[PDB]
Structures are given as C-alpha cells and as structure tokens.
Amino acid sequence: KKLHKEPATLIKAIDGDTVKLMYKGQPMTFRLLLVDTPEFNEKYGPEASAFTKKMVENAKKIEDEFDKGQRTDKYGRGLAYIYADGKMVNEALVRQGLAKVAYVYKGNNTHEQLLRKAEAQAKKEKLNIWSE
Numbered sequence: 865k866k867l868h869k870e871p872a873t874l875i876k877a878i879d880g881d882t883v884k885l886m887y888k889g890q891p892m893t894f895r896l897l898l899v900d901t902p903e904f905n906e907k908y909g910p911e912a913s914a915f916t917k918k919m920v921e922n923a924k925k926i927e928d929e930f931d932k933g934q935r936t937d938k939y940g941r942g943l944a945y946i947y948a949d950g951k952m953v954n955e956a957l958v959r960q961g962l963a964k965v966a967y968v969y970k971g972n973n974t975h976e977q978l979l980r981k982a983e984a985q986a987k988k989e990k991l992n993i994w995s996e
C-alpha cells in the first residue's frame with residue numbers, strides 16, 4: 865500500500881494544525897496528521913498559526929495525502945499530511961519547534977520516523993516549544 869498526494873484546494877488556514885479545504889467541492893476542515901500545535905491563546909500558538917497560514921496561503925499549490933488508516937476523525941475532520949509546493953507542512957512545523965509529534969496511531973503513522981527526526985533536530989537546537 866502506497867501513499868499518494870493529490871491536488872488540493874485551500875479555502876483558508878485555521879490555526880497551527882487545521883486548515884479548511886474545498887474537498888471534492890465541499891468545504892471541510894482538515895487536521896494535520898501526527899502533530900500538535902499549541903492553541904492560539906497558548907505560548908507559540910500565534911507563531912504556529914502564522915507559520916502554517918503563510919506556508920499554505922502563499923504556496924503556488926497545495927496537496928493532501930491520506931495515510932493508510934482512518935481518513936476522518938471523530939469530529940468529522942479529514943486527517944492528512946498537507947504539502948505546500950511539495951514541502952510537508954506537518955514536517956516543517958515540527959522542524960521549527962512549532963508543533964510536537966503527537967496523536968501517533970498505528971496504521972496512520974507512515975511519516976512518523978521522518979517527523980521524529982525533525983523533532984529531534986528542533987529539540988537539539990532548542991527551538992520555540994523546546995526553547996530554554
């Protein structure tokens with residue numbers, strides 16, 4: 865079983881780890897897989913929100929990639945990896961210490977090792993959430 869990115873259409877960025885897509889012609893919230901950004905009113909929340917917003921809004925295009933397992937969560941949100949001009953937003957947040965690796969469920973964990981490699985680098989550099 866292989867993962868494949870597909871073309872996506874942005875309506876708007878919502879916060880650090882959620883975006884609104886026009887998915888098959890319906891507005892739908894997507895939650896980024898394997899990451900957790902702070903809430904806007906928590907430390908680094910505004911920064912994570914603005915980093916995801918600039919990355920998706922300013923991209924020439926965005927793509928979504930489901931993993932192998934559940935595609936929608938218990939709140940109806942789609943669960944995907946999101947790419948902006950080919951760069952994974954989920955990884956970039958982690959690499960900048962603006963999200964933690966989190967919500968790792970077996971069966972939607974394809975990019976776990978990639979993301980924990982990014983988090984280890986953000987922790988070594990003491991970035992943001994990991995700053996001292």
Ligand SMILES: Cc1cn([C@H]2C[C@H](OP(=O)(O)O)[C@@H](COP(=O)(O)O)O2)c(=O)[nH]c1=O
Pocket residue numbers: 882895896897898899900937938943966967969
């Ligand atoms: C990332 C992700 C979150 N979730 C759920 C778990 C958390 O629900 P509960 O705590 O209600 O159990 C919720 C966290 O989302 P937010 O971080 O967007 O608040 O989203 C999944 O079910 N699957 C996922 O892959």
Ligand SMILES: [Ca+2]
Pocket residue numbers: 881900901902903
């Ligand atoms: Ca969150």
